[model samples]
Target chain A: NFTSMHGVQPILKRIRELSQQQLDGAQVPHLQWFRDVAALESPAGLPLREFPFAVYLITGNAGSGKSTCVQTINEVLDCVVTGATRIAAQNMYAKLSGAFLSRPINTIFHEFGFRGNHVQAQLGQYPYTLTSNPASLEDLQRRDLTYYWEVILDLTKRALALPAFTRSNVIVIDEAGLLGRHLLTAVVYCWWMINALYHTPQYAARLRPVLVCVGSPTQTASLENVLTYLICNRTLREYARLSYSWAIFINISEHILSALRDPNVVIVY
Target chain B: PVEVTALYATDGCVITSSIALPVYIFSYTEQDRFEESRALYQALLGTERGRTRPMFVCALQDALAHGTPLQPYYGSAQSPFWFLSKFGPDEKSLVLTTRYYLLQAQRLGGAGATYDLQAIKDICATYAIPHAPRPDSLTSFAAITRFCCTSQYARGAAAAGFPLYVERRIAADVRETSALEKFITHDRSCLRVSDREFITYIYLAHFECFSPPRLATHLRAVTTHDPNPAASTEQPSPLGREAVEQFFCHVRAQLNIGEYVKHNVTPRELDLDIALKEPVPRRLHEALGHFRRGALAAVQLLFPLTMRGVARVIQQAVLLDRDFVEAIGSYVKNFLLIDTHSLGGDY
Candidate 1:
């Protein structure tokens, strides 16, 4: 009865026969896909087709396992890793640090776009240099003027389009809260455009890729409904019926070590 | 969205019109409409395929005036945005102005219309001032009928409404018992009724009463029902207890629930990985879009507050991710503050 709302309306339809087999058919039910991409630590594992993509919510209540699950996912998946912080400058520092290039992990970029530092490859180096002008304090301090996300989205997609990165397969971002509202929309739109939307024909021909996001349970919960709505309503269902897979991990208990056994759970700090 | 209003004097001539239009209403399958439209424009005004026509200009005016019954698909295809580009003179200027017009329209219409067909056509046509072809006759009712059918709606045509079709009602039992009915043979799809078979299916769907949502909404408003509070209260949670009890009783009256359950299998999730891995207050955006174009009327209607008020509200609108929460918070805060100030000031 608790789950009656889940299927009663669908069951009453005159069209097709309802079955449990059909109910769990690849599509994730009950929850919408998260828009925030999670950062992957080095050595990202082979695709877990069932839940090939995931939003690992790293959160904990006291002794709960936020960091453990995040670190474990990074270790198990063997992905290149990046860190995210609440402060904008810290995120900017991470973006500037070339964390994404150091190891093939996805980076949660929270920096203002005008910082002008290249997040792309420069010469033979991994992180590219910033060429967009920010010579004045005016440029650096400007607020509420222009949408900084435009530059990031344009450049991120261009970078992802590079031939070398295609084989790398996954892109992840940690702590999606660092992204501002418009930037969040831009980021999700860009990823959807590139990773899922563009690959439709290729997917038909058998090429599928995954995108993941790692965020704290607190952060995920805070923005979960909105983030999820954007992905499922705006990007997936609204844009296309077929798109990327989503896996959400919530660690109910605080013990990170114990939560590791179930892929559905995320341990938080 | 466009704000359209019509004020009338005793003569019913619109005294200074003001109405908001539905901005997001656009057709995705409109390329053909555009081509046909351009040709019609060329025929009517001697304009090239991409030149602006007069009808578009009129439609734009009517739209701006607001509450003008959107000119029934005027100029070429009857799609209204054509008016904007029909008047633009030069190609380059047309493109620039058309973009401005569309961006403004989209701001007025909201994202659905702008990002979709209507806005795009307005933009493109304004640049080229294209000509749209018009059909010589209304031999077929297919397009309008199809729209009606898809929407599951039907209305009396000129035939159904005789001299005064106004507020007239016929006996509910009037039956179509004609032994034989004549229907047009050409492109049978154009017929008023789709098919005999489809009609029969509709009759069956209406035979006994299974309350579909639309029917329920319609029926409940005008009809009276005998309420048995016990019947309602006894109903179970989740699946309506009444519906379930009724179902079981119906099954027992016919056969048995035991028989049904014997064949049913409970579902279970298989913890396995497969091939995949994947990763609106629409109003404000639209209002801002109109604001960018300096459309005062549109701005005034969408936003209850003044320009400064609108800006202030938006500034406090919170980040997109926090919208719903922040909206609730602001509403609660405003309510408390207002209530407190009013009471305190009076005392």
Candidate 2:
């Protein structure tokens, strides 16, 4: 009976496709669909775009089909679904049996700011000599991997513009669970694709100031003034709302899943 | 949603995404490890009030620059803002109603009975947000609900060891009604806290005498500076600076009890549910009652704040005040339960 369930079919079918998928001389896709937009080819025989704007969370063991599934989705969608690290991305592509070697796969590591020629270059701590010695911990807060968010947003916007990518509007973030373990880049980067970019039309306006006001109890404003500002401003949710998606986790921590776990928690404010 | 400015993210902050919509992958869960490379991501934004430069512009210019890059501003983590430190009676009541409405709107996918639309438009109009020519289909509301969530049906499927979940729309409204139903039929879950939260939770659970919302309003009062020093621009806080200072000092005093808990009690052993599961000691009974449901609050203090001296501030209060040594005594002894009779003589 569950097999006939509507959502189950699409999810299960994707899992099946990724598990046993093997490619040979497949028309491998490229992210250059946007970098060089004018020099384009006609739409190829790609299947109807699999799940659009859907979030999939997979939690499987090491020797399972996840790598193959990732590779499968990469080939099928021509879009890179990253896990914040290239090790996993490379390994997934490495799982290809034969004939796919020698040729490199263009897996744009979105979160880490790699893959893009310029984005990677800018994702560095350039030798800009400073006036005074910097404070250690203060510097640590915004140190290494600096210019990250800005660089990656550009790379994604370009890729998302590709005609092929528009077909599915499907973005994959392989290791969503592991993303913020060390830093919030993965989550922040995901927000980029989900519309949390700098000066994005909505948030750049008054909404951001309200969010800032709410954050600081000491921010100056009469209670009435502050309340008016917040009630009046549009929450980012008004525009950048997160719609349907999936989350996969290994037998890992519930720190992320727990946010998704509570049923009794009714948030009115 | 969490107050914008915080260190270390938690599941509570992730609450928005959990209830929206989801598609399940009813399968196995084991082994999918990734290394943590806490490397190379600080100080990119060199100076927009310490905020990161516009990413789009950065990417564009980086692609076109001569050498490396311009130093972009990277400020403290920024999120939506709220001001709640000083509130007159009028201000307090307004905010008290606000968070509640926001919380309720969260349940209904960001809107409640279409009436607030007027207030919603009122602000939008002032902010200069463009409006539609045809206003009939205007979908403006305050609450912002996240939709990247999946229910625990997989656990059911997992327990049953079945792959199929059978016929679901997974449509927005289908689950909306279910999530919506719980909103209509549920009560606030008991407040749970650990580590840094122990004291705030203790206050909300046991100590506070007023309605949670009322206190919620008090905590979020709007403070002030001398408005018109010369010709007179404004006045000082209506609530009086000393009372606001008093709130912080006392809440801090209560929080230092945290110094006691984090050092003395294990979170597992401090389990309120099991500890209070069957208490009957007249004293411990009082302590448990103190923690039952004082209700919603937070004491998010700024870091490195100079509290007079952290020593006698708590030592005297805990050891000398109101026969407290015995109340807090066995709590520290015999695990978290009261040693009941440990008094000055031990077993």
Candidate 3:
């Protein structure tokens, strides 16, 4: 069941608006990539015929607009966007807004633009509530980022349950390295959520989102390991081929490839 | 013949059914094959612990012909002369044995080298399977088997109680059988999403800031930017005469030919309030506190209509408290409509 693709216009308009300002000739490649990504459609419009979902691994030098590219995608996609870097920021807000302030009801509405008011009304019945606080905000300064990150992830999964929200079918994650060796459990949890959602008849065909990730090779390798484990060890046979179609954008120069190939920069597959 | 009918009635022996026990033996060495048989035969021939040697001999001869392992010890142990006088060998009970040591090697871990004990130890340095008798050597099959039996999972088996020795076909069968259950386990707990992290992601999608400090900075910038540019600055810094007259006329909303120097309220404070409350898309109450005394302090002298413009914007945004709006409206009306005749300085 293919819809008329009418819902995509607002996104296109926003992209156009976003593109017209403060941007110069240097952003031409990014714009081209964005256009290419937006234009990509399924082969013959069939599910899993040419792979169901898309994975894009965007990488570049530290100051080379990799994040800007992610933001640009966010401007167009307007779906679930996040990264490991903001993992701490999430905790700080939760502590100040939820715990210390004792106002669990005061959650920032997750939508942007005019529709945010509507989405806020829809998401109003969310069940997570912060109850009595025993300590002051000053005393609760020491908090675990990992714990907070889990909470954030959990909330994302919860939000995905709403059919209206799931229709967006696009996610952007930044600094994916946080789910690396140090956070293997989180990685496992992520793969678990993905596999379950992807395989299920409820979400598979319809809401198969494009997962856009931003990370260096080391972090990507860790993510690849998680995917490999899901495919090989867990024996999700289709995930192997599906994940192989991942679009890895090593936006660095050809010279950097030799440096990346250096033996010291060990990529643990 | 001892009368069959009398035996049936009293002795219970006529037409009786009986089974002879069967036994199995195995031996590799000559000693094992010959020593136990020869000793038993000789002991049967001459009974030292028994009262009757010939009775024991007959029982031993019966046992040697057809005996089951552990079946001969059914009756009282004190009665050494017990014999199967009319028993026949039971096909079910007939014993058998093999002389080979069977060590059924199991995959014990799973498909990967992860199941291998050596691999496991290598991955987890100083690893020992907890609660098992320490393996004599970590790499030994014996140790591996012990580990599988004692540890949380067995390699070749589906779960704890499943058979250790499984054929390739059966192994595949088990894997398929428990595949859904295994998937559920992984999906539910091990792979459960972190609540805060998920919400954080969604929020990040909306805000797109890297840190809380960054978020604060962005928020400040958003609120600080002038929403209505015309009110912020309308003319040259040092205004021209025409521009000054035009500003006065615009502020008075009437003729400004020096007729009636009307001290009309400028909407600078109201405009500031509107600008303060605009960028805060949601939770306007939280960003700008509830309409207390100090809330409208900036534009205290402004008229009800001008003040209502601020409330109407907030009301349209659906963030305004109706009571707060009404409270502001009523306070403005009362302030504007108060009978000044009571005070001496009024009329």
Candidate 4:
């Protein structure tokens, strides 16, 4: 799916800028109508008239084209995409071309310094990659454990307060359900305000970020509670009223362009 | 396949034996257990015992039943030869059991996927634990999927009802297209977050879990700095004087910096392999590195840092930021030290 022929970035950027200005001034815009309708209008964390953020959960059962829909949005959105086969070729060329070549396994224990001895020391013992296998789960948890999101948030605060690059940026994340039920490390707003992805142990938070997590319907189950919590807590906190109007449902693979063209609710710049 | 022979030693004599490749050897008896244990002791003491380390086993079924080791070294040259084992009763009548992995793979081949899956299910069934759906779907994608595994010891000295414990393990295979399909055929199972999920919970085993303090420090010291001097440069402070001047100029030209924050700059990806690059003058590059490292660290910290504050600290400590240097060094150094363990600086 793609945006309107003119592009969705412009629309998204304008919305993001308004959110930042409000949050900076300590405010959250109205979204009650959107939340009243579907999960898409909902955003993560406390929703205040001062803070405007967007979140959408393309939910379904297994084989319900959950991934396919995510893929369509992502392709239209051009979010995160990496591949084993593709990465391998890239890594090989990188190695040969004098660029840093990180092996799948060797990417772990990151931040290694110059020196062969250290490499040799870790040659057999260090975990290189955080790939999944029931066997490697603990290792993955351990690796993620080593990261602290607080620092990144601090950076993002300064990033968002900036008066530049207020538009034309986006951060896209995939496989978000697999975050193992933890809070998003880098705040979405911070990623947006910074106009760059601040990589963390879990997902990558980026600027003008539209987080599109693609996973199976089962994956949606994992997120439902969290999203509900995000929506409910904001309501309870009196952060802002969630809108229950204009919920529009579409085929997961409907080109983003067509989908945006038919948005039940229109956002103007 | 090549046939390899292993010779074991017994009291006052050498136990001569020839074993073929993919061979399975077991030493069953309290005497054999004592001898094997002694061999391990000797290996630790640096007293020569055998040419290679030997695997110890009790029951093949029990071994397989073990959910999985926290650390599983794939078959490699440096793979440690032995792992912790659970043994059974007394000396004379003691049953000694050990299973080598090589031949096991072949035997497992004949059992077929269905049989193997059933075996896994049966083991879990005995403990009232459910097996994951047949045919993992994660085999195709390059992603890690995990779940919490909890159970108690099957057979141990202190027998107790199932004591609740939580542990996480990776899926066996995530790339399988069948993984998504299997989720479809089977009732969808929702994985739940089991705890408060504070930040420290994630780093438990890696840094905080190791109780001896010494051990934790040792592990934390394993992470090194990026070696590429150029790649680790700091993101220039947007609120610095120069930044302000630039911003004012841009505004004079009718541009908006807020617009810049939202749409212009791409995200900064930590160059993971920069640490593998050639060494530079640690001091000359130290200032730049500290700013870069701190900027990145600040991104992860919840404590707020103003653009002005960051610029000031970075400027003052650029060359003299010894704490940053030491922290960077500590990240790379592979030692367990008291100071390194407590690199605790307030955010």
Which candidate comes out best when scored by DockQ?
Answer: 1
lDDT of 2 at A87: 68
Backbone steric clashes in candidate 3, count: 27
Candidate 4 chain B: worst 10 consecutive residues by lDDT?
B161-170
Q: What is the C-alpha local distance difference test score of each model?
A: 0.26, 0.26, 0.27, 0.25
Ranking by lDDT: 3, 2, 1, 4
Docking class of 1: incorrect
Candidate 1, residues B100-170: lDDT per residue as tens digits?
Answer: 23233333332222122222333232122122232211112232222212220111121111101111100
Tens digit per residue, CA lDDT, model 4, A1-269: 11111112233333334333223322221224223322321122222222234444333234333333333332223223222123433443343223111122211011111123333331123223444543232332233222422332333333334222232233322333333222332233333323333223122222223333233223345414323333334332132222211111222322222222332322110
C-alpha displacement of A29 in model 2, angstroms? 25
Instruction: Please list the residue runs of candidate 3 whose C-alpha ends up more than 4 Å from where it truly belongs after superposition.
Output: A1-53, A85-167, A181-205, A219-269, B1-347
Interface RMSD of each: 27.4, 20.5, 29.3, 21.9
Q: Estimate each model's TM-score.
A: 0.21, 0.22, 0.20, 0.21
lDDT of 2 at A17: 35
- Provide per-model DockQ scores: 0.02, 0.01, 0.01, 0.01
Chain A TM-score, each candidate: 0.36, 0.34, 0.34, 0.34
Poorest lDDT segment (10 consecutive residues) of candidate 3 chain A: A99-108
